[PDB]
Design a protein around this ligand. Structure first.
Ligand SMILES: Cc1cn([C@H]2C[C@H](O)[C@@H](COP(=O)(O)OP(=O)(O)OP(=O)(O)O)O2)c(=O)[nH]c1=O
Ligand SMILES: Cc1cn([C@H]2C[C@H](O)[C@@H](COP(=O)(O)OP(=O)(O)OP(=O)(O)O)O2)c(=O)[nH]c1=O
Ligand SMILES: Cc1cn([C@H]2C[C@H](O)[C@@H](COP(=O)(O)OP(=O)(O)OP(=O)(O)O)O2)c(=O)[nH]c1=O
Ligand SMILES: Cc1cn([C@H]2C[C@H](O)[C@@H](COP(=O)(O)OP(=O)(O)OP(=O)(O)O)O2)c(=O)[nH]c1=O
Ligand SMILES: Cc1cn([C@H]2C[C@H](O)[C@@H](COP(=O)(O)OP(=O)(O)OP(=O)(O)O)O2)c(=O)[nH]c1=O
Ligand SMILES: Cc1cn([C@H]2C[C@H](O)[C@@H](COP(=O)(O)OP(=O)(O)OP(=O)(O)O)O2)c(=O)[nH]c1=O
Lengths: 245, 245, 245, 245, 245, 245
């Protein structure tokens, strides 16, 4: 047992992929570990995607990880546009001028390669179809075929479709060891559903004004729950910034 | 993806129909885009119609757009009287004298043609009936038949009638691409209802003394919320003017 | 529409029954129109009845209108005594001498006929009962049977009794087209209640020393709010006079 | 109505019990009428009791009225001593000599009968208890049993005790028609309380040096407010005298 | 009978193994007696294992008892890691640093012997198989072969598998006299099942925030039910502490 | 018939052995009559034995009756321990201290004689065997040989064993005239079985929290059914007390 415990002790990965922008989030969660399902939820337009996109950007950019992004709702161009702006600390969607200037400028192309030139980000859309298996098959490919370290499922809104999917999702993450982050629409802990709350390893909720409050609704590994801290959205750069609240 | 993003970038219309009279409204919203539902709300007699009528006037007059106006509460003559006065910076309803003077003067007729002579404004009333489909059918006609760029629904007060209508309205706007502005009576964000808040793309609220404060309660496209600025109602011209508050 | 607007323009009555004694009141309200409910409120003993009685006197006396007066609190003799004095610029209630002198003098009778001789004023009391319908039935009779142009309800103090009554009152005024002035006891805009503020077309508030300030809390038709002006109560004649404040 | 108004006119009592010592008080109030509650207030030691006692003396002495005096704070002997001195234009309480001289002199007894010999004054004390009903029952007896025309409640200082009492007091005065004068301690109009200000028909306030200023804070019947005049306290006779201020 | 009762009285063990960390738990239960089945239940991640592990630690450490721990879900290394940390008031699983530091430090080995050096704790895993008898045979061995005073079954979630097992478990405890604590997952009293509630001698439920509330759902021996008290989880030491709620 | 009815009237015993601790139980049942079978049922650990033991104590102690107690489940020492504690308003089983203190104290012996010194209570156990006749023979002996007035059968849980036994029990009670109280385990009226419900003359059910509610499910003699009242268990004395629910 002794030797058995020892190697067990020296082989265990407690700290996963560290989160960014929110001082305290890593304290209460110790980052994202492989095989876990992170659920990021909140009200519509409350900043779910931004937050996740930001994590994706850092992970694939600074942590040198391969990030797959599966979009159920929006298109790849939309997602790409968002990452490019984010990466360049500008909001392409808000500036008809910038979009136009950047294309003739040659900065678009320069920006495109400086981000997707490498084999780091894998964006997939067209899952418009309500079939889970079709979805799991693509996810499994992103993992195995493209070697994605992290897979972001954007998004899901609260039957078996969700129940069974959540159970399939959790199964896929646990067996492969990839980090699966799922974005779910909440229209508190109960605000979700059975499997949603149950299968998810860590649940993060963003709250706003009615500055974003980052609440850790659940973290199996750590058990440390409560509010991790606050973030301040930069309307000019589109980045969620750490706050002094 | 590259070419896919590029054309996507160069084909996207971020800035819609610009609003008028309130310095800052366009900052936080970037105007009214086609396919979106703009909700303008506030207390009764707080200036909702005036504000909307003003936007209508400029859109159809200066922006060279076709504006359809569907009145649920008041008559076409009433609406026409309002636009004519507005257009002529006078308040016809307040002056028994002006009304009388303008008719024999010949200015009425001159005013009438100089405004409705063209095929720009389309006023429709008699929707007194509480039937949605009867209403949607007329709206669809204003869009297709009369080629209206903007449709103003005046008005609605806070069931399914509103819920289902809001969902029908939003469906009609999104599929056709017309700009649908709806005026709703509020007797804050919650001050409305589910679909009311949910389906509406941009929600504008006017506040007064208890000078009008223009608050942007919600803007999906931009996410930029808060107070856009102030306006000053001209009791002599009936126009809401930009303020130096 | 053109012809439709025209006749609409030449048929609309913007200026109603003009008020008296307060320079500016007509500016911000354009008088009292038929079908509207005018609410006159203020603190107890602040001059509500006097003000209304004065308007009644002029309307029925100079404007050649038929005025019905329904008193909930006081008796007809009391009301008559007040009008007679007012009409004769003397305060009967304050002078035991005058009352006595006028009766033997023969001036009482001369005063009585010179005021009520004609079919212009209709005073009704004994509504001591808290039943609305009993009240509405009498009002409707004053309108139809006695052809009253203006009906003054004196008085009401701030449930459904008031809520439902206000809604019944407003219904009666709107459908008949009579001018209904209601006197309400306030123990600002909120100082009242839902229907009270809501159904009332124009709300006038009198303010005193803690010379009477005439504040226009609300005017649907005009929207012109604020203080209309000042009046000076004549302790010798009992008349509220226009001031030079 | 005519005959109805006439008799109404010839039966109405405008002028009540006239006040004394202050030239102008009767002008702005027309005296004390039966069924009304007169409130006399001011700072402690400002001359409230003296003023009231003086009115009592004249009413019961010259006006040939029956005056009941209910003392909550002091004793009957104290009150009697005060009236006797007042009546004899001397201050018994200030002169150990006079008190002693008057008793052996035989003037005490002569003074006692010449004042209380008759059935005009009714002094009652021992209401030390904070029970209203116990108090109302005594008051009602003074009215009915002893036929008191005027009842003076001395005193009250500013809950429901006061609120409910004021409402009970006003009820008792209105239904019986007695004149009820209440002395209240003020530690302006607001200086009192709800019912205090509300139920009281006439409110008199005495002001001094920081010669007594007599201010009429409120008079329902007349509406005539403001300062009625000035009085000059005679430190030798204890009488408040009319002034030439 | 007398002598029969006497010795009966002087031979009966009312107070069993005292619990720790929760002031009041022993009051309502009088500890854990041999032959009884203690059921500790609550929601997943609510602190069941910690609580039980803590009791185990004290029993085997301070009470000088032999504690067998049978883990159905997790491994021995995991369990050992937990006890070692607990014993050393540190959370090994949360600190990649501590784990690493402790191994080279030599503190691991020192910690290992200072806890398992003796023959006090007996950890057994690999019961992954759903066979009861295979399970009962191991338990019986832990009792007889290893002389375990207390056996902790971790864990069971709510057929006959549970029904029959619960009946086998209770049979084993009653006949041997060992103290059997079973941890069951609850997804109130009914929240369990027939045998679960029936065979269990004492049922403890932990409740948290939607500080841990310790509720005694059932205690045959004592009958004393209700909430025993509160505990406060120390996120730094991993120990559940007694509270001042 | 007359004389026949008369003596019949004057010889009939309507009121039996009165129950204790529950205000109302005697109202709806009129006590326990000889020849009747009282069934006391409820959930396990719901207080059946306590309740019955209490009745036994009072009957044999205060009513001067001879009470036989036949225990099927537990031993005589256990039963004796319970009665002694009950009799001394202490819970011997819960206090290892008291048990020990009382024995050396000499209070045990004093307690033993002061309760069983006399020939009032007859406790019999060892009926562990499932034979009815063996059981009936002992019961018959307790009646005839020991002259027991009341016999308590503790206990029975819900075939013919119960059916035939219930029929034998009822036969024994009816023919001898003893009062037979039987305690049955219920795992409403139907909650039992044929003979159980049928042969039993009076059925009492205790209900608790999911303070004990005493429900009279059946009373042949009286027919008066429903809830008799409430009792409050004293965790310190072990006595069920009458409540103020
Ligand atoms: C957090 C935040 C978001 N936003 C904007 C950016 C986007 O245009 C918009 C939505 O942000 P998202 O990140 O898309 O929010 P969401 O993912 O919760 O929304 P949905 O229900 O649509 O999936 O709001 C702000 O303008 N300010 C802010 O502080
Ligand atoms: C904003 C404003 C309005 N108004 C007047 C103009 C109109 O006669 C009246 C109502 O303005 P509207 O524009 O009709 O206000 P609304 O649409 O919120 O009202 P409703 O509940 O009746 O639909 O108020 C002013 O007088 N001053 C002002 O500053
Ligand atoms: C305005 C005014 C009123 N008054 C007097 C006239 C009346 O006797 C008395 C009340 O005037 P009212 O016109 O009766 O005042 P009101 O209608 O607000 O009162 P209520 O609560 O009793 O219904 O006040 C003055 O003496 N001076 C003034 O300046
Ligand atoms: C008015 C006045 C009163 N006084 C004296 C007479 C009395 O001894 C004393 C109080 O007069 P009071 O009439 O008792 O005054 P008050 O009723 O307001 O007082 P309290 O709070 O005690 O009830 O003051 C003067 O000496 N000079 C004056 O000018
Ligand atoms: C009670 C408590 C537990 N925890 C953590 C410690 C662990 O990592 C995690 C689970 O505690 P456990 O003791 O494992 O809870 P459990 O046994 O009820 O759970 P399961 O369903 O998984 O068998 O929660 C806290 O972080 N804070 C607390 O206050
Ligand atoms: C009624 C009651 C019982 N008890 C306890 C006393 C005993 O130790 C235990 C059982 O009471 P019993 O009187 O034995 O209950 P029962 O006869 O229905 O049970 P069984 O199925 O075991 O035959 O419960 C309380 O602690 N509180 C109470 O309020």
């Amino acid at each position: 047992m002794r030797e058995r415990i020892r190697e067990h002790l020296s082989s265990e990965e407690s700290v996963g992929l560290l989160f960014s922008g929110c001082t305290g989030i890593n304290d209460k969660t110790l980052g994202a570990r492989g095989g876990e399902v992170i659920m990021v939820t909140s009200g519509s337009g409350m900043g779910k995607s931004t937050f996740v996109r930001q994590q994706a950007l850092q992970w694939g950019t600074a942590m040198g990880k391969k990030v797959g992004l599966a979009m159920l709702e929006e298109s790849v161009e939309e997602t790409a546009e968002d990452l490019i702006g984010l990466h360049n600390r500008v909001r392409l969607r808000q500036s008809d001028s910038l979009k136009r200037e950047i294309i003739e400028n040659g900065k678009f192309d320069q920006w495109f390669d400086e981000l997707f030139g490498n084999d780091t980000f894998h964006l997939y859309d067209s899952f418009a179809e309500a079939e889970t298996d079709r979805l799991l098959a693509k996810l499994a490919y992103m993992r195995s075929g493209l070697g994605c370290d992290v897979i972001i499922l954007d998004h899901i809104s609260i039957r078996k479709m969700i129940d069974n999917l959540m159970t399939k999702l959790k199964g896929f993450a646990k067996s492969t060891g990839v980090v699966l982050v799922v974005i779910c629409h909440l229209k508190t802990d109960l605000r979700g559903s059975g499997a949603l709350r149950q299968l998810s390893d860590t649940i993060i909720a963003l709250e706003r004004n009615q500055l974003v409050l980052v609440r850790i609704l659940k973290c199996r590994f750590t058990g440390d729950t409560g509010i991790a801290g606050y973030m301040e959205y930069n309307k000019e750069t589109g980045w969620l910034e750490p706050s002094s609240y």
